[PDB]
Amino acid sequence: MSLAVEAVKDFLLKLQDDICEALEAEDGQATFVEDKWTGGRTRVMVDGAVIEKGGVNFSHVYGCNFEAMGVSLVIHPKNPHVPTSHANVRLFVAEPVWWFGGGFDLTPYYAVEEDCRDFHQVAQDLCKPFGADVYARFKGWCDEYFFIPYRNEARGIGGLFFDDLNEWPFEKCFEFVQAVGKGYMDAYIPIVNRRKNTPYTEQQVEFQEFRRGRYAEFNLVIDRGTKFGLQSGGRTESILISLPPRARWGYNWQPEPGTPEARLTEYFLTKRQWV
Amino acid sequence: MSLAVEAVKDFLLKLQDDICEALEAEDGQATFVEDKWTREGGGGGRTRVMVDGAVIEKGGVNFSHVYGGCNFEAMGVSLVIHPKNPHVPTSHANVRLFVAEREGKEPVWWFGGGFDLTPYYAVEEDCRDFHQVAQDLCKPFGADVYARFKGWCDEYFFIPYRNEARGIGGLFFDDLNEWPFEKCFEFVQAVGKGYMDAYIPIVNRRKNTPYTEQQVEFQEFRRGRYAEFNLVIDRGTKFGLQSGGRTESILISLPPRARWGYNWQPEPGTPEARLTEYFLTKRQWV
Ligand SMILES: O=C(O)CC1CCCC1
Ligand SMILES: O=C(O)CC1CCCC1
Ligand SMILES: O=C(O)CC1CCCC1
Ligand SMILES: O=C(O)CC1CCCC1
Ligand SMILES: O=C(O)CC1CCCC1
Ligand SMILES: O=C(O)CC1CCCC1
Numbered sequence: 303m304s305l306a307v308e309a310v311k312d313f314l315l316k317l318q319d320d321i322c323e324a325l326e327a328e329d330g331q332a333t334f335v336e337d338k339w340t341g342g343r344t345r346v347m348v349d350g351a352v353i354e355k356g357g358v359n360f361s362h363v364y365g366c367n368f369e370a371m372g373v374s375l376v377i378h379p380k381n382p383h384v385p386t387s388h389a390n391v392r393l394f395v396a397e398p399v400w401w402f403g404g405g406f407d408l409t410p411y412y413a414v415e416e417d418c419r420d421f422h423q424v425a426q427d428l429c430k431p432f433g434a435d436v437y438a439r440f441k442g443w444c445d446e447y448f449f450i451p452y453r454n455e456a457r458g459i460g461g462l463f464f465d466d467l468n469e470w471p472f473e474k475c476f477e478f479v480q481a482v483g484k485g486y487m488d489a490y491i492p493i494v495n496r497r498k499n500t501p502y503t504e505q506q507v508e509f510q511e512f513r514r515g516r517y518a519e520f521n522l523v524i525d526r527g528t529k530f531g532l533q534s535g536g537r538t539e540s541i542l543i544s545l546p547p548r549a550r551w552g553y554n555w556q557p558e559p560g561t562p563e564a565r566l567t568e569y570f571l572t573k574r575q576w577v
Numbered sequence: 578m579s580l581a582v583e584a585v586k587d588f589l590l591k592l593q594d595d596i597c598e599a600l601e602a603e604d605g606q607a608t609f610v611e612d613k614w615t616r617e618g619g620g621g622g623r624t625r626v627m628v629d630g631a632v633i634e635k636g637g638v639n640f641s642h643v644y645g646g647c648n649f650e651a652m653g654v655s656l657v658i659h660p661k662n663p664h665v666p667t668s669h670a671n672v673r674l675f676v677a678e679r680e681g682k683e684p685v686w687w688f689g690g691g692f693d694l695t696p697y698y699a700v701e702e703d704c705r706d707f708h709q710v711a712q713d714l715c716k717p718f719g720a721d722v723y724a725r726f727k728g729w730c731d732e733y734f735f736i737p738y739r740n741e742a743r744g745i746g747g748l749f750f751d752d753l754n755e756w757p758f759e760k761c762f763e764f765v766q767a768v769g770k771g772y773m774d775a776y777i778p779i780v781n782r783r784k785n786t787p788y789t790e791q792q793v794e795f796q797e798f799r800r801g802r803y804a805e806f807n808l809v810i811d812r813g814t815k816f817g818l819q820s821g822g823r824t825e826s827i828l829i830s831l832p833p834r835a836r837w838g839y840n841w842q843p844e845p846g847t848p849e850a851r852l853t854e855y856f857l858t859k860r861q862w863v
Contacts (some may be wrong), residue, residue: 337840346839357839452818515831522808523818532738532809545837548797549804553610553626553637554825558851 305398306472307369310393311362313476314373317391317483318343318360321375326485328494329353333372337540344540347545352498354380357368357543363536368396372404374482374527376544377490379537382510383500385410385417385458385493386517388544389486390527398553402467402475405440406486407448409458410494412562413570417493422576424489428481440464445574450520456571461489461501512544512555521545521547522533549557578675578684581758582650585674586642587621588762589654590623592672592769596656597625599773603780604630618646618650624826626643634661637829645820649677653690654769655813663796664786666703666744666779667695669805669830670772672765674838682777687754688761692772693730693747693793694779695803697796698784698848699856703779708862710775711748714767718760726750729836731860736806741808742857747775795849798841800832807831 306367322334322345332350336343339480342361349351372392376551379386383425389406408421431435431552444463462482521544522530557563597795601607615621622641627633636658643651653673658814660667670692676684694707708727715723730749735742748768753761806840807814808828 344839347837354837355837450823452821511834517838518804519808522805523815530811535738538738539840542837543839545801547838548834548835548836551635551760551804551828551831553628553635553829554612 303395303398303472307371307393307395307536310476311482311527312370313480314360314371314391316518318345318373318418319479319558320359321373321389321483321487322358323562325353325356325377325494328491328498332370336434339537340395340539342537343461344537344543346543350380350383352379352384354378354492355547357540357570359543361536361539361540366396368394369442370394374544375486378546379494379498380516381498381500382411382502382506383497385413385497386514387486387490389490391483391485393479395457400468400472402479403465404479404482405444405461405463406489407461408490409464410566411450411513413459414497415565417496418570418573418577421459421461421489424485426577427564428488429487429523430477432470436478437462440527443458450518450524453516453519455516455567457517458575459570460574494549508550509557510545511548511550512552513566514549515551517546518549579685580675581762582652582674582676585762586652588766588769589652589672593623593625593638593654596638596670596773597627599777600627600633600636600658600780601630601697603777603784604632606631607633607636609822612823612826615711616644620650621825621828622828624823627692630661632660632662632780633658634845635829637832639829641822641825641826642834643820643822645655647677647679649675651675655829657843659800659832660780660784662784662786663697663788663792664783666697666699666776666783667800668772668776669693669695670769670776671770674765685754686758688753688765688767689749689751689753690768691730691749692768692775693734693744693749694776696856697799697850698746698792699852700783703782704830704856705771705862706748706778707745707775712863714771715748716843718756718764719768723748727791734806736802736810739802739805741802741853742860743803745856745862746860792806795843797832797834797836798838798854800835801830801837803830 329350329352332347334347335347336345345358347356355515356377360373373389376388386409391404417475426437444460447463607627613623620642624639627636638656640654655671657669672690674688712723726748730746733749775843
């Protein structure tokens with residue numbers, strides 16, 4: 303599958319370009335600066351109108367020999383009313399066992415029901431042609447994966463997660479990750495556009511930062527991709543672009559019940575049925 | 578072993594209070610919080626946390642007692658202190674005892690613990706003093722004890738994927754049972770006392786030092802490194818979280834605020850660069 307694998311590589315590089323262009327257009331102030339290494343292409347945006355810290359990475363890496371390639375991204379907006387988001391699409395080939403993985407997910411601070419519904423609707427719509435149960439399966443997997451067990455708490459409002467994807471022919475699995483990659487932009491960008499101009503306060507930023515401690519915890523304690531990258535000698539700063547620009551931790555920190563800070567965990571993180 | 582283990586518990590609970598007293602004496606106005614709990618198996622904990630002081634921003638001192646293929650009992654104190662002023666180092670200490678039953682023989686026991694210093698704007702004299710207290714407390718127990726446990730501290734408190742030490746070191750030990758129980762117990766008592774003797778003078782000396790917004794920003798970037806060590810590497814933290822321990826008690830180690838920046842490194846030749854240029858790789862203080 304040398305031609306097929308190169309087809310996946312060409313798609314991933316273009317996907318990175320396209321996602322970067324789309325986020326640059328929304329921000330329209332800041333841009334992605336590229337760090338090429340050997341290998342990979344790490345693109346980072348800081349201090350924009352909208353994006354406080356964002357990273358969109360392409361990597362191509364080489365007891366069993368393997369080749370892997372993928373795009374991974376995490377966007378941390380300045381405005382607490384714009385959710386953090388994450389997406390991934392990847393291919394693993396173990397020499398000739400192959401599989402795809404990926405997904406996207408939304409991490410609100412001050413959540414809006416309609417946005418959560420829209421985000422999931424984009425996900426449901428893109429999965430439908432690939433199988434009647436694909437959305438249910440990979441939405442459920444997203445809920446199970448992006449969970450902090452020791453806090454009994456979801457990371458976000460969900461989306462799609464999949465791994466070990468090879469149940470369909472290579473062509474169809476490839477088409478699926480193309481749909482997921484395009485879908486990320488269709489799901490997230492309209493929410494960015496709708497919420498980026500919402501006024502916010504210093505107190506709302508403080509809440510955002512406490513919530514970003516939860517995000518950091520997931521990525522550093524739990525996330526499998528992060529752990530493998532760090533263990534296998536990957537590029538530290540490329541792997542850890544996911545970390546928030548600022549986080550807070552407080553002893554016994556919990557929002558007072560009946561505050562909008564509390565509603566995130568009282569309602570939004572526990573709903574788990576958006577469409 | 579019941580009486581012996583009870584004596585260790587008594588020591589640990591007193592040490593928790595003594596350390597809190599020593600730290601508050603320097604601060605004068607930190608708010609103290611306490612949580613206590615027990616577990617159905619037996620055991621439990623007591624966490625004391627000082628926050629929003631003139632000197633200590635977030636300082637936690639935890640006592641826990643755990644019962645859990647063989648049955649075991651464990652108890653210990655763990656603490657992490659994060660000052661408000663960048664010129665006062667963060668510090669950490671631990672003393673612990675494990676006792677595990679074995680079939681067909683007497684239980685196996687061991688102690689572990691240590692203390693260590695995590696500066697932001699380090700000072701050579703302070704690093705030397707900190708290590709001298711450690712060297713002096715070890716001397717009565719054996720001529721190679723400081724060298725062993727200082728070296729172990731350097732090995733353990735290291736972030737391999739950044740090729741960077743966490744701090745300037747101190748003492749670290751585990752599996753300590755090469756001496757009779759009573760001598761090992763005396764050693765962890767000396768380590769616990771030693772923590773105060775090593776750290777409190779530095780707090781007293783540095784707490785009034787002027788600081789700037791830029792220095793606090795640097796402190797926060799450095800605290801990202803600290804969070805990484807505890808969440809990615811630290812074995813005790815992992816084991817606590819995996820075992821269903823009290824989350825907020827385990828995570829007292831995390832800094833009040835941290836920053837992460839893509840490729841962030843201090844500018845060479847600046848005061849912010851001194852920590853990594855000189856202090857972290859010196860590893861020779863007495
Ligand atoms: O999706 C990514 O982050 C890249 C893949 C994961 C490890 C190498 C390729
Ligand atoms: O997390 C990211 O955004 C980058 C990927 C995470 C693990 C490998 C690369
Ligand atoms: O090379 C690896 O171990 C994979 C890392 C994950 C993101 C970049 C490289
Ligand atoms: O010293 C501690 O932090 C407590 C010990 C570790 C697990 C139980 C006792
Ligand atoms: O949660 C407990 O009962 C004890 C835990 C062990 C380390 C800190 C808390
Ligand atoms: O980090 C602390 O200070 C608390 C201990 C860490 C592992 C168990 C408790």
